[PDB]
């Protein structure tokens, strides 16, 4: 009716240009959908119980991340079980399928085992097993041999989140002759930055296979080759398992294309990739490496200090509001939360601040523009799910539909209809535990993990899940009686035979 | 490539221009429907055949001219020459036929001298003119003009008297016997609700309503036709400035519209034609209503095998701006080559449709439609989205009153619109919508409806096959609803042929 | 609410469509310029005055009739028709030489009848005995160039034959199409294959002779076809502009080279409209003008714009859509044929095409069309260019009644009318055959000074500047309190403009 | 040609520009977002403010919340100091414009506990007053405008109170949101008072040492902007009044605000504890959206790159909302403790510019300029209509800069609200306008020192040619470059009408 019109900043949605959509943007403007970019949440002694568990699910986690650069195997296996107990210790249309991301270690380069190293300083780099434990103002050792056949005369190098910087002069037989550029307090076991797969990464991704996680993290992937050895690593077992590349690097960013075509999917890992380009030139690599995924209709997850602060204070800065905001109208697909979950005093209320930015960032989306910007850069295709999925889209947009439900064994029928961004909720019925976890990755989908057996009549089959979409949507609050929906299915049983939409209303 | 592909990626309007290729052959079935005017050279049954074949759609009966015996006439040669096709069911064209009502008509060799006098006579030559319009000699005044046959003589009263109006004649010129008068400085006449009545007993599909200057006008022609004439669609005809400026009501009440610009023209100044012709079309695409343009299309071809070059550019013109239907009048009531005319409108409109530039045309006409809850609107807008997406061959839709197929074509796919209907009155109606190819069904309902559905379904295809539209390896788009009876239409799936 | 600007700030074409009005009364003056073929029913000076004062721009000869003696009169009465009317008034009329050209021509009523059989002969000795079974034609290599099964096109394409067997005597044909069949009617082969003629050669120079502004050369097929015509007009033809006509096929196909060499096009749409299908002439039309429009060159659409004109007093609804659809196209200017040549009311034609193209001009959605000619112009460091749009867009900005311009050659008046500003662009110039040639850019209104150079050249560019106002005032396209924008440049001599300035009118 | 994100500027759609964004394309423009820095212990001392300058601070923010008139006055000469100390090469001088921060409503506690949450504590206005139990603060009537519940909060709004009672005694509260709490902290109530005698006091004191601008706290309808006009007085009357919106009033009267305001603070350290912090980005992109729309100044501001008060490096949430900021379409950017306090305030400034101009430099012209050339409305004014023709000629030929001369700061304010790529150097022999300008984005200002000449013409060329000198000698321009020059008729404000495209030599 009447006040329908004026929440999730539908006044701005129907504006005629980008700029006046800003112009109408209103915070007395309340969002109305269930909030789509999925949150990544990193284990760590903050959150590794049951009950926290529990209350970050509750608070709107959906990813959890396992972070390889710390910890045993049998720590890491302690994470996954904590996480499989907290889900399965919740009614099936409640239920709620937490993804387990494995991001490995890759190839860090860390210093040896507080002191001032001050800006005019002559510091020596050496990789001397004998001075690996002899750090000092004027030593630093690193665990990295060929540190001294790789950088030249020139040439710079980053210690510790890149807050000390080193130029190398001369290379005498001891190590690198550097001068302090930027000085700072070193501590132990820093790690290093110099603007393929390892033997720890490998044992690892086996290990991620045995315990069954969903998503690897894939560190520093720099071409395409890299992505290969990744999945060679997983093996014929792990062939389900999805692959984000970590792009991390100046060639990383520029073999983007090359690396986006072989994953399936991307995280801006912003950490390392503002110590390895200018910090001031990330939000460049960022946007572009978003837009690139949107278009492409794969994945991508905004990473590292967006909520930095909040690891010691209940609040976060100006500025971190800003970074989720825009970070999902950018495009993202999911954002991230590290130390602000692993290790930070505030974990739960970390988790709640993501939710209730990103959710006001999603209805400040301009679909108008996107979506004809989408549609107008996508090329034609001849496959019935990606027709079936843009005119689904079209038909939610025309009607302000609740929901878009979809029956989907793999995922891709629901990946399809997010990659258009409807405003409307995809709600994805499926059978594979394991698909309704991945989906998370793609913003705006809703997965509902379905337990019983086939009907007898297939067909039956098919108007039962939609069903079960239809209640759980309303128990969730997605859907009321009165509501339009959208209803996306196939013709037959098995993978890839999506083509029918059909335009419902909830009783 | 072909129908004007590489103009239809263009980025702007003026690169498409630019790109418009005279090599780029269509492809697509033509879909702006062709209203032929019945009359002496286009009237007998071996006639009709041919313009069948040619392409007419909409046979329009001039009830201008003829008694009710001679339309009589008219209808039925044309239900046999239509009905001459049935026995080829995957083959048959339904042709609708359009009562186009006389009117407030005002009528009348000898030479008018510019300069000289003409008494204006309705008392029971060069220097008098008698007309059967009684009040014409009390509603101009001095000095008010009268205009006279197609608006090329044209006089100015000097003085008012009881032999009636002395006038100067101001613009002079050759007068024959009872030529149409214009005092653009009357109801619904009695002729015509006679006439409708007449157009209802014989089954006329379309009623094209004269001289519609506001909402009341629509209403009294709705009242005339009566509770049994209640399916008939009424096209109001816009003929004066006030039909122009009172357009939005008019539009509001009438099922479309024709821009009837031969009254259009002397009504109002002959180039301000074009606008009001472009803004009614305009806004009869806003509003998903089917819009005629009419009048003087191809005239030459009234004595002349060809066209000149400012008839086809006229033509292809309409389909530019957004017309559902072209018409000829002259060039097939009365001329020397009725059946070369209408295959001149065909191949013309097939080379503009071509050229639409459906990049904007859908994204503006998307942006301007209001949201809606009407699930076959929803479905409507889903289904064409999804045609452009796989450039389907076609979109089939199963109607039972035309309506599911009239809000595909209001998108303007450049997919066919193949409407499967048993309507045989829906087949021939749908033909005002540009793009709709109407297929009669003709079979008894299987007993299971599912299956039933699937039959017409898979009928629409082996029309579609058999009439070039689909090949084995196309994609189409088919739009059907949950249950059975119209206004249910809420499904669109995306099938192979095969 | 005039001028229909409320239909110019609609977001959206189409909404732009539904807020056209034909209560909006056109305010600006007509920007097109109307191009009059000169014949029988035009050639007294006192119907070319008639047909100046119905707005008559350039006067064509068309040298497919008429000895050189009969042109040079037509060229005669132009010139004492325009010198016979106070100099802030004069009007320029251009003088359009349009060539013969490929011309093919039977030999001097009789009917063909569809089925008859009809020999086409080359022989000397058949000129003069055409009959309803024999045709003569002016081209004595057609009998090696149409095949059996060829198709030979006869007056205006109404009548077609179809070569059966070739001997002797000539083509034996049988009548595809009949008709009936006049003396010395055109002839197309649009099946056949074959540059200047003689003729053509010295019907040029004629036109140097005689001072002519413009040519406009047929059968352009390729860029060398412009060249044979420059170099035909020699060393004191340099100044005459040539406007190539796109007549064929290959025209069409090779339309790029031809207007990278040419000053601009003409649509020569009734030999194109035999020589590609008649349905597909739109096609090249809307294609030609909208290139003429982004490469800035001038474009004119020609033939039967108001045919039954030759001998009725009003236009067919078909004809005054076409003239007002060729304006929206992007047309720099209309032109005028048998209409003006040899019909009943030739006057009246140049007053219609006018009434219609100042409607169909205040109709254009500049909103679009600048935007789209700005977003597809390429970057240039030439100041003329950069001084050009900026005062278009200052122009719009606050709706200046015009934009004044200094010009030499009529270069910067071209380039501003090539964003096509809604405001006037009024050309003063001491060139009066620039002044002439300039009428083929759509809403240029040149104006000639003729004083001599003051002794200081600031004074000298404030004064033509005030004759520009002065006129633009008593002409009506200016009024006390109109905002206008000034263009001039730094230093005398063509190429040097780089200044806009923003004026009040007092 | 490729540097300055050129092959994305020629993207057909924003998603295409984008995807073009090119981390290896440098950018060749002069930074254009001013940069404004607080003044502090960490950033008040000559030496120190010399090299803030040199690092691209353009305006120094006074403070008034803390410190004293001789405080101030200090700071007020040691810029000036500072500043003057570059005058001796009028070809580079940078002006720097100085802005007077007003105090405000603000209330603040007593004279380091901390607050347990689910704990009762009283909120007290007693004279004779804290710790764990009880909070004093400086506002009476406190007591009387929050009923029970109604929140309270503390420091930054870290801390929060729920009233339950009220008493005479106070307000007895439960700590909602508990915390570490020290002396005098800024006390927040959402939804609960005019301009203050302080603050009048702190006007005149700015009028009386030419302050150029002031950025007035907690504006919430018009008549608080004509409360700081009516208190600045005759002699204030050329001082930009620029409007910090802190609060949900202030949101919703923004359009009265804005029609009365020389420009905008989107002050988002009070609107975020005012608002929810999850609804200050829309606040700010629509505050930022209408000023571009009005062609005025918006300024945004408040914890950019807060982590560097300690860090010598800022966080990836912190360049990226600087970033945006100026995508968004932000005048000016601020730093605060940044500068005022902490130990890299040098280093602040540098991230501040160098993200600036890498965001500058994505900016999508192509749409940005249409959105802006649509949306503005006809005009008869000539400075406008010139300024617009200027914009679109500087595009059409990449221009280096538009060199125009100012008297007020009008015809360059003009200019810069269209967006040009190119710079827009604005000569101007109008020291506070020279300064003033600083709050247009890509206002590039020359004070201008001699004499005029003789005939003004040729004072015009000269002037002209002082932009050119300095646009070489600063970087701006080579031989060769195109250039577009606005001038006006005759002397005096409000006569521009005049554009050339000029070759430099
Ligand atoms: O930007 P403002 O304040 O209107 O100043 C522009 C003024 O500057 C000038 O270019 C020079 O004026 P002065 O010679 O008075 O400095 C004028 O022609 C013009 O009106
Ligand atoms: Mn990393
Ligand atoms: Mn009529
Ligand atoms: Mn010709
Ligand atoms: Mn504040
Ligand atoms: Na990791
Ligand atoms: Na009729
Ligand atoms: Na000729
Ligand atoms: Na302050």
Known sequence: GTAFFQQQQL??????????????????????????????????PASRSVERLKEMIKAGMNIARLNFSHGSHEYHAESIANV?????????????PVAIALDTKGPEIRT?????????????????????????????????PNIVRVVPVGGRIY?????????????????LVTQVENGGVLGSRKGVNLPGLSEQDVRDLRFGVEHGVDIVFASFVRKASDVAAVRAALGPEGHGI????????????????????????????RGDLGIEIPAEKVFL???????????????????????????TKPRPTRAETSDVANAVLDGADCIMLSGETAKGNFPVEAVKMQHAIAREAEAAVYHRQLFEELRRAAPLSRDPTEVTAIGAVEAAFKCCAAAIIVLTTTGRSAQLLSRYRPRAAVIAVTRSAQAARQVHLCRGVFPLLYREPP??????????????????????????????VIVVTGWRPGSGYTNIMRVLSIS
């Open 285 to 311: 690599a960022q946007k572009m490496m978003i837009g690139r995924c949107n278009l492409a209709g794969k994945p991508v997850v905004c990473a590292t200090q967006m909520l930095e602060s909040m690891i």
């Open 159 to 175: 210690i510790d989140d890149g807050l000390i910087s080193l130029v190398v002069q001369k290379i005498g037989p001891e190590g």
């Open 455 to 484: 009907e007898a009549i297939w067909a039956d089959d098919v108007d039962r899940r939609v069903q079960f979409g239809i209640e759980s949507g309303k128990l969730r609050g997605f859907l009321r009686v009165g509501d339009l």
């Open 112 to 144: 040896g085992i507080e002191v001032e190293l001050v800006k005019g300083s002559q510091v020596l780099v050496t990789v001397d097993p004998a001075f690996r434990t002899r750090g000092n103002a004027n030593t630093v050792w690193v665990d990295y």
């Open 11 to 44: 006044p701005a949605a129907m504006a005629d240009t980008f700029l006046e959509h800003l112009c109408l943007l209103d915070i007395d403007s309340e969002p109305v959908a269930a909030r789509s970019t999925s949150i990544i949440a990193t284990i760590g």
């Open 242 to 269: 999805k692959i984000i590349s970590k792009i991390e690097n100046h060639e990383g960013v520029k073999r983007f294309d090359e690396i986006l075509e072989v994953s399936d999917g991307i995280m801006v890992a």
């Open 84 to 96: 499989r107990e907290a889900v399965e210790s919740f009614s099936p249309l409640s239920y709620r």
